[PDB]
Each structure stands twice: as C-alpha cells, then as structure tokens.
Design a protein around this ligand. Structure first.
Ligand SMILES: CCCCCCCCCCCCCCCCCC(=O)OC[C@H](COP(=O)([O-])OCC(O)COP(=O)([O-])OC[C@@H](COC(=O)CCCCCCCCCCCCCCCCC)OC(=O)CCCCCCCCCCCCCCCCC)OC(=O)CCCCCCCCCCCCCCCCC
Ligand SMILES: CCCCCCCCCCCCCCCCCC(=O)OC[C@H](COP(=O)([O-])OCC(O)COP(=O)([O-])OC[C@@H](COC(=O)CCCCCCCCCCCCCCCCC)OC(=O)CCCCCCCCCCCCCCCCC)OC(=O)CCCCCCCCCCCCCCCCC
Ligand SMILES: CCCCCCCCCCCCCCCCCC(=O)OC[C@H](COP(=O)([O-])OCC(O)COP(=O)([O-])OC[C@@H](COC(=O)CCCCCCCCCCCCCCCCC)OC(=O)CCCCCCCCCCCCCCCCC)OC(=O)CCCCCCCCCCCCCCCCC
Ligand SMILES: CCCCCCCCCCCCCCCCCC(=O)OC[C@H](COP(=O)([O-])OCC[N+](C)(C)C)OC(=O)CCCCCCCCCCCCCCCCC
Ligand SMILES: CCCCCCCC/C=C\CCCCCCCC(=O)O[C@H](COC(=O)CCCCCCC/C=C/CCCCCCCC)COP(=O)(O)OCCN
Lengths: 63, 77, 62, 129, 65, 80, 129, 65
C-alpha cells in the first residue's frame, strides 16, 4: 500500500498515470522506495530534501 | 518494541550499506561495529524475553494484592 | 522451558534431524538475504527516482 | 606480533594432533618426513583424477539420460526424489536469474531513451560510474 | 552395471544450460537497448542539423541578398 | 554442550564408584550408531535423514531462495 | 541428434577403456557395480581432506616463514629457486593489477570533473552503460 | 621433520595480500574520484542558485517598486 502510494503521488497523482509507465520504470521506483526504507533515520536526507539549485522537479510539478 | 524497531533499522542500514568495508582497509572498524551490534541484538532479545514474563507476573500480582487486602482468615480449633 | 531435545553438536550435524534441517534452511534464507540486498541496493545502475522531491512521506505525516 | 603467531601455531598444532583419522595422520607424517606439502599433493591428486574421469562423466551423463528417458526413473519415484528435484529447480531458477544479470551486465534493466527516467541518468553524481 | 542412484551429471549440464539461457536473455535485452539508443542519438543529430539549417535560413533572410 | 541457547541434556550417574568399577563394558552388544560413544558428540555416527543431503546444501538452498525472492522482480517485473 | 549422441558415448567409452591405471579402473568398476558416481565421490573426498588439512596448512605456513626468516632458505639458493621466485613475482604483479581494476570497478581510471574528457562521458551513446 | 622443499603456503598468502593491496589502491582511487565529483556537483548547484538570484534581482529591478 505504501509502495503504491509513493508511485501514484510521485508520478502523476493517478493510477492511470503510473500505468502509463513501463514495468521496468515501476521496478526502479519501487526499489527507490525500498532504499528510502533501508536508510530511514540514518540515510542521507537528500533523498527527500531538495538541495537549493537542484534542477529536478519539485512539489508543485503536477499542480 | 519501539527500541527493538529502531535498533533493527540501524542494524539493517549498517549491514546493507557498509559491509563492503570488509574488503577495504577500514575492515576492523566495521567488524568492531558489527560485533557490537550482535551483542546488543542478543542483549535486547534476552531483556525483552525476561521483561515480558516479569510484566505478566506483576500484572497478576496487582490483582491478587487487591484480593488479599480484604481477605480475613479464621483459625481452626 | 528449554528442557531437552536433539541438539546438533556442530553445523555438519544439522542434517541428522528434519526439524534442524528446516532450521538450517531458514538460517540460510535469513543470512543470505542480506548479501542479496547489498548487491541489489548498492548497484551501479540503481538510480534515484527523478520525482523523489515531488512527494515524500515527510510531507504527509507532518 | 610474535606471541600471537606462536599462539596461533600452537592452537593449530593441537588441533592437528587431535584428529583421529589414520589416513590423515599417516599422510602428514610421511610428508613431514619427506619435507613436502600434503595439501598441495591432495590438490594435484584430485585434479589428476578429475582429468582421468572426464570421459567417465560423459558416459555417466548418457547413462543417466537413458535412465530418465526410459521412464525407469519415474517408476520408482519417492518423496526423497521429489525433495531433490525441488532443490534442482531452485538452483535452475537462481542460475537463470544470475545469468540474465551477467548477460545484461546490470542488476536492473537498462532504461530506454523514451522513458521518463532518462533524467536520472543525466543527473548522475559521478558519470564515470 | 546397476541403474544410477544419482543424476549428478544431468543436473550439472542442466545448471550450465540454465545459466547460458539466462545469459542469452540478458544479452538480447542489452542489444535491443543499445539499438534503441543508437536510433535515438541519430534522431537527435538529425534534429540538430534541421535546427542549424533553420537558423541559417533565417540568417540568410536577414542578409537579404 | 550448547547450540545457541539449546543445551544438550546429560544423564546423571546412578551407580557408585565401587559398583561402577565392577561393570564390564562390551561394545560388541552396542548398536552401530553408538560405538565409541562420546558425551560431547553423541550424534557423530548418526545417519543422515536424506542420503547425500548435507547441512551446507540446505543452508545454500535457503540462500538461493532468498536470492530468488530478492531478484525475481529484476528479471520478470510486473506492472501495478 | 541420436547418432551423434551414440558416437560421442562410444568414443568416450573407448577412451575410458583405454587408460591403463589400476586405481582408476578399480574405482570405475566398483562404482559401476554399486551404481554410484566416481567423479562426485572424488570431489567429496578431496573437500573432506582439505577440510581436515586446514590447520596443517597453517602449521606449514609458520614453518616456512621460520625457514625463510632464519636465512636457511637463502643459504642453499640455486637457479631453480630463482626461476620459482621470478614466477612468484610475476603472479604478484598481475594479482596487484587485477585487484586495482576490481577495486575501482573499472578497467581505466575514472575521469575527474575538471578534466577535458568529461565531454566524452556526456556524449555517451548509451548512458545506461 | 625435515626442512620444507617448497614454500607453497607462504606464496599463497602473498598472492592474497597482493590482490588485497591492489583492491585497496583501486578503492582509494574510486573514493577520491567520488569525493571530487560530489564537490563539483555542489559547486554546480551553488552556481545555479547564484544565477537564479541574479535573474530574480534583475526582474525585481524591472518591476521597479
Ligand atoms: C555451529 C553453528 C551453526 C549455525 C547455528 C545457527 C545459526 C546462527 C547464526 C550464524 C550462522 C552462520 C552461518 C552458518 C555456518 C555456515 C558455514 C559452515 O560451517 O559451513 C561448513 C561447510 C562444510 O560443511 P559440510 O556440511 O561438511 O559440507 C560438506 C561439503 O561442503 C560438501 O557439500 P555438498 O556435498 O553438499 O556439496 C554441494 C556442492 C555445492 O557447492 C557450491 O555450490 C559451493 C558454493 C559456491 C558459492 C555459492 C554461494 C555461497 C554462499 C555465499 C553467501 C552466504 C551468505 C550467508 C552467510 C552468513 C554467515 C554468517 O559442492 C560442490 O559442488 C563443491 C563446490 C565447488 C565450487 C567452488 C567455487 C565456487 C564459486 C562460486 C561463484 C560465485 C561467487 C560470487 C561471484 C560470481 C560472479 C559471476 O563449509 C563450507 O562449505 C564453507 C564454504 C563457504 C564459506 C563462507 C560461507 C559464508 C560465511 C559463513 C560464515 C559462518 C560463521 C560462523 C562462525 C562460527 C564461529 C564459532
Ligand atoms: C572487470 C573485469 C576485470 C578482469 C581482469 C582480468 C581477470 C583475470 C584474467 C586472467 C589473468 C591472468 C591469470 C592470472 C591468474 C592469477 C590467479 C591464479 O593463478 O591463482 C593460482 C594461485 C596458486 O597457483 P600456484 O602457486 O601455482 O599453486 C600451486 C598449487 O596448485 C597449490 O595448490 P593448493 O592445494 O594450494 O590449492 C589451493 C590454492 C589454490 O586456490 C586457487 O587456485 C584459488 C583460485 C584461483 C584464482 C584466484 C584469482 C584471484 C583474482 C582476484 C580476486 C578475484 C576473485 C577470486 C575469487 C576466489 C574464490 C575462492 O589456494 C590458494 O591459492 C589460496 C589463496 C588464498 C590465501 C588465503 C590466506 C589468507 C591469510 C590472511 C591472514 C591475515 C592476517 C593478518 C594479521 C595482521 C596482524 C597485524 O593462487 C592465487 O593466486 C590465489 C589468489 C587469491 C586472491 C584472493 C583475493 C581476494 C580479494 C582480497 C580479499 C578481500 C576480502 C578479505 C579481506 C580480509 C581482511 C584482510
Ligand atoms: C554483477 C554482479 C551480479 C552478482 C549476482 C549474484 C552472484 C552469486 C551470489 C550467490 C547466489 C546464490 C548461490 C547460487 C549458487 C549457484 C552455483 C552453485 O551452487 O553451483 C554448484 C552446482 C553443483 O552443486 P551440486 O549439484 O550440489 O553438486 C553436487 C556435487 O558436489 C557435484 O560435485 P562434482 O564432482 O560434480 O563437482 C564438479 C561440479 C561442481 O562445479 C562447480 O561447483 C562449478 C562452480 C560453481 C559456481 C558456478 C556459478 C555459476 C554462476 C553463473 C556463471 C558465473 C561464472 C562462473 C565461472 C565458473 C568457472 C568454473 O561441476 C559442475 O557443476 C559443472 C557445471 C558445468 C557443466 C558443463 C557441461 C557443458 C555441456 C555442454 C554440451 C552442449 C551440447 C550441445 C549440443 C547441441 C546439438 C544440437 O554447480 C553449478 O550450479 C554449475 C553452474 C555452472 C554455470 C556456468 C555458466 C557459464 C555461462 C554460460 C556459458 C557461456 C560460455 C560457453 C558457451 C558454449 C556454447 C553453448
Ligand atoms: C506441458 C507441460 C509444460 C511444463 C512446463 C513447466 C515450466 C516450469 C518453469 C519453471 C517454474 C519455476 C517455479 C518456481 C520458482 C518461482 C519463482 C517466483 O515466482 O518467485 C517470486 C517470489 C517472490 O515474489 P515477489 O516478486 O512478489 O516478491 C518480491 C518481494 N519484495 C519486493 C519485497 C522483495 O519468490 C519467492 O517467493 C521465492 C520463494 C522460494 C521458492 C523456492 C521454494 C523451494 C522450497 C523451499 C521450502 C522447503 C524447504 C525444506 C527444507 C527442509 C527439508 C526437511
Ligand atoms: C560479476 C561479479 C564478479 C565478482 C568479483 C568481485 C571482486 C570485488 C573486489 C573488490 C571488492 C571491494 C570493493 C570496495 C568498494 C565497493 C563500493 C561499492 O559499494 O560498490 C558498489 C557495488 O556493490 C555491490 O553491489 C556489492 C556490495 C557488496 C556485496 C557483497 C557480496 C557477498 C558477500 C557475502 C557475505 C556473507 C558473509 C561472508 C563473511 C566473509 C567476510 C567477513 C558499486 O558502487 P557505485 O556503483 O559507485 O555506487 C552505486 C550507488 N549509485
């Protein structure tokens, strides 16, 4: 349930948007979720905190 | 259970993402940390095993103490 | 109560009792799943999600 | 640095003396008398035997294939054979997966140019890796 | 010559064949990905050429000969 | 001896030294499973449950199952 | 598909019969009578011996270290020992190089960000590899 | 117990040590390269932030409040 929530929220906010991806892409996303789980309180905080100047999409990307 | 969960998370983190140090020149530090984690793992499990039974004992002892506070015993003659 | 039963003297004896055979199989699973995670989650071609900053559980629980 | 070495040597010597295998002790004594290495001799004997048993392996493979194909193997099928076959199937699956990973030389499938994950490749911290 | 009590050699050959087939699956996957990326790079170069030609055409019109 | 927290039970002696010294040991009557019996290793000669199935083989079987569990989705991914 | 298999089996059978080693033939005959595998038995015997000779290896290592350190090895030095030492040095160099390649997980040294070759990394045909 | 005619075990240990030392050399090299690239990416992000701030400043002046 948590894995599917992360996939839906990070890639469109809808199930159809996630299904627009390929199985390989979904595998990558799910394994990144696993990475986040394994760090949890000890991993690097750049996995969820965007450093200033980063070019990747932000929270208002789909809004 | 909070303490167990947090320690298990730390052990998973260091075991998965820092075991490569066994092949590196700082292997002794990782081996020391890993041995410490194993020791803490065993200690936590033993402590929890003892504490669960002790807590059940105390839980029943409180109820029996309530009962005993109002019991009056006669002497056979 | 841990009173008695078959107790293998060493690793090689775990195959002398079906229950300990299952136990050593399970121990193999337990210990061997960690190397697999090392290989899988420290892979060269593993890439962080580009949209990892779009949403995080930290937002939701806050 | 020297005390530790002496302690390790003494422990291994005690363990070597402890074992009660007549053949192992006899070989150790003979090699100590001659000054040669028993372990290396064992390795060379093993490799020689395997070199001389290659065609025995081929003949055994064909005999086993005939035994399986003829249906005689399944006639006497038991639970132990089922356990062995399950072990065999598990090894086959794991070997297939490892072979796929080695064949594509990557743990994960490669990303296609039309995928939205290409950005991840572009934003690598270290392009060398 | 009794019937074989073990099937070790057949199992060994099967292990080799399984690993080989996995290798082929991975190789096919990688080759397909490489072909896709080669085509993509070719398309990118073609688009760059077209963009350069359009820029040169606009500059030619500005030249106004 | 111990295997983690599992301790091997030991039978208490019942005979006195005087009576014990008069006992004549004849291992020819003993079962083949227990000859040269050692309290520190009573199952050294005990038969295997499955002939040719080693403890290392079972351990490796579990390791392979774990690898399959973690790597199957890498070769045969499925869509949500 | 069947003629080829029969031909291969016949050739290997001829070669197996050809060898004139008493021990190999005796083992083959015994295993054929019992229906077991001789090659696998050889492997298991070898691994058992090596398991029982580990501490012998440790003791031999310490004895050899004492022999070298005491200077007795160099007292009787000959040309054959020189040849062996040259072989040893060559293996050490090759192992060091292979270790370096595996340690950096790359055949070539990685490119620094300030190098002019970074463009090469950017213009990779397949960023996945 | 005669003197050893061969030095196989010492040679084996030396082989292991040589491979291990090579591994350490490679690991040190890779770690240094990774640190260099991390610093480079940090500098790139800082430059991007400064460029964005300059653009915002120019836009602010154009706003003319
Ligand atoms: C006392 C306590 C006991 C446990 C208590 C309960 C649990 C408590 C928690 C902790 C438990 C620790 C783990 C249990 C112990 C395991 C080790 C052991 O004792 O095994 C004995 C065992 C022999 O016992 P046996 O029952 O007499 O076996 C008879 C023969 O083995 C013959 O067997 P067979 O007849 O079945 O033969 C089957 C077949 C099968 O043989 C094989 O398949 C050989 C294995 C090949 C490798 C495959 C995977 C190996 C597993 C690695 C990952 C392990 C992860 C988990 C480890 C956790 C350790 C804590 O063999 C062959 O055909 C011969 C092999 C020839 C091939 C050799 C070349 C291999 C190349 C591999 C390529 C792949 C490499 C990667 C890169 C590839 C890139 C392309 O010894 C070994 O075989 C050891 C070899 C491997 C050593 C390293 C293994 C991992 C690390 C173990 C550390 C343990 C620490 C314990 C400390 C104790 C201090 C007091
Ligand atoms: C990206 C792609 C790149 C590709 C690059 C190119 C690839 C290669 C292409 C071809 C290149 C040309 C050919 C080169 C061949 C070279 C190899 C060769 O011929 O080997 C035969 C050669 C023996 O030949 P020989 O002298 O003619 O033997 C005569 C008799 O046959 C003797 O018979 P035997 O009865 O003795 O038979 C057993 C013998 C033979 O066994 C073998 O044949 C082994 C396998 C041979 C191939 C090995 C290739 C190695 C390449 C690098 C690593 C790759 C992975 C290898 C996986 C091996 C798995 C077993 O076993 C050994 O050799 C044992 C070696 C290990 C000794 C372990 C001792 C450790 C003691 C540690 C004590 C520390 C105390 C510190 C206290 C400090 C206090 C302050 O053996 C070796 O060279 C062994 C090398 C082992 C290197 C292992 C390095 C592992 C990584 C470092 C360790 C990290 C983890 C542990 C850290 C712990 C903290 C310290
Ligand atoms: C990027 C990083 C990725 C990392 C991923 C993860 C890495 C691994 C982590 C750990 C994972 C969990 C553990 C899994 C362990 C699995 C392995 C294992 O346990 O092995 C033990 C297992 C035996 O265990 P067992 O059944 O308990 O044995 C009982 C006794 O001990 C039996 O004792 P024995 O006396 O029999 O001892 C000898 C025995 C044991 O030997 C070994 O133990 C071997 C080494 C074991 C490790 C192997 C790992 C393999 C992994 C993939 C490859 C990596 C490189 C391996 C390099 C090996 C170098 C020797 O030898 C063999 O097994 C022989 C196998 C080869 C058979 C060759 C037959 C070829 C016939 C072809 C005929 C074609 C005719 C066509 C006609 C068509 C007409 C139309 O052996 C195998 O599984 C052997 C697998 C060999 C695969 C080779 C694949 C090579 C690539 C494909 C070929 C490409 C070139 C040639 C093409 C030619 C054109 C067709
Ligand atoms: C005409 C007839 C044609 C017939 C053709 C037949 C073709 C057969 C082809 C091969 C089929 C192989 C099937 C089995 C493998 C399935 C793999 C799979 O789906 O894995 C995904 C699943 C996982 O699914 P998953 O991908 O959802 O899980 C991933 C989970 N995360 C993401 C969290 C990591 O893998 C497993 O669960 C593997 C479990 C082990 C499998 C092997 C079991 C062996 C027995 C062990 C127990 C007994 C031990 C006893 C010991 C003691 C004895 C006394
Ligand atoms: C095809 C495989 C060939 C196998 C050869 C292996 C040779 C390796 C020799 C050197 C090893 C040490 C290198 C030190 C540096 C490693 C750094 C690292 O983590 O590398 C990962 C590669 O790491 C892995 O995938 C493997 C990690 C460790 C795997 C462990 C293997 C199995 C260990 C079994 C343990 C069981 C218990 C045994 C105890 C014995 C030792 C005490 C890739 O790094 P990057 O791509 O730059 O970062 C990716 C992030 N974007």
């Amino acid at each position: 349930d948590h894995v599917e929530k992360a996939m839906i929220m990070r890639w469109g906010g809808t199930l159809e948007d996630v299904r627009k991806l390929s199985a390989k892409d979904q595998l990558r996303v799910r394994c990144f979720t696993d990475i986040e789980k394994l760090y949890s309180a000890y991993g690097p905080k750049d996995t969820y905190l965007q450093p200033p100047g980063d070019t990747l999409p932000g929270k208002d990307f789909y809004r | 259970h909070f303490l167990l969960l947090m320690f298990f998370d730390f052990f998973y983190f260091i075991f998965v993402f820092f075991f490569y140090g066994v092949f590196c020149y700082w292997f002794i530090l990782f081996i020391f940390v890993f041995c410490f984690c194993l020791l803490f793992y065993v200690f936590l499990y033993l402590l929890d095993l003892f504490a669960a039974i002790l807590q059940l004992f105390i839980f029943c002892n409180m109820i029996l103490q309530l009962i005993m506070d109002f019991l009056l015993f006669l002497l056979f003659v | 109560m841990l009173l008695g039963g078959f107790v293998p003297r060493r690793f090689s004896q775990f195959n002398r009792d079906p229950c300990w055979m299952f136990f050593i199989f399970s121990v193999g699973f337990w210990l061997g799943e960690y190397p697999a995670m090392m290989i899988k989650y420290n892979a060269r071609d593993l890439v962080y999600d580009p949209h990892r900053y779009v949403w995080s559980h930290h937002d939701d629980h806050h | 640095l020297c005390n530790a070495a002496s302690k390790v040597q003494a422990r291994s010597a005690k363990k070597l003396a402890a074992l009660t295998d007549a053949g192992i002790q006899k070989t150790i004594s003979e090699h100590n008398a001659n000054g040669t290495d028993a372990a290396v001799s064992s390795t060379k004997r093993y490799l020689a035997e395997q070199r001389q048993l290659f065609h025995y392996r081929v003949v055994r493979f064909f005999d086993e294939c005939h035994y399986i194909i003829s249906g005689e193997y399944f006639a006497q099928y038991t639970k132990v054979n089922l356990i062995w076959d399950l072990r065999f199937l598990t090894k086959l699956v794991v070997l297939f997966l490892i072979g796929t990973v080695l064949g594509r030389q990557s743990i994960f499938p490669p990303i296609d140019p039309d995928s939205p994950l290409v950005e991840a490749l572009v934003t690598k911290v270290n392009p060398n890796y | 010559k009794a019937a074989p009590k073990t099937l070790h050699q057949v199992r060994n050959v099967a292990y080799f064949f399984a690993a080989w087939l996995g290798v082929q699956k991975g190789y096919i996957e990688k080759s397909a990905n490489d072909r896709l990326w080669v085509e993509h790079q070719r398309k990118v170069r073609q688009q760059n050429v077209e963009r350069q030609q359009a820029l040169d055409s606009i500059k030619l019109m500005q030249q106004g000969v | 001896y111990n295997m983690l927290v599992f301790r091997d039970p030991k039978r208490r002696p019942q005979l006195s030294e005087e009576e014990r010294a008069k006992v004549v040991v004849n291992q020819a009557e003993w079962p083949e499973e227990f000859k040269d019996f050692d309290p520190d290793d009573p199952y050294k000669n005990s038969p295997e449950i499955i002939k040719g199935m080693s403890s290392w083989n079972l351990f490796l079987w579990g390791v392979e199952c774990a690898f399959i569990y973690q790597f199957y989705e890498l070769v045969f991914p499925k869509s949500i």
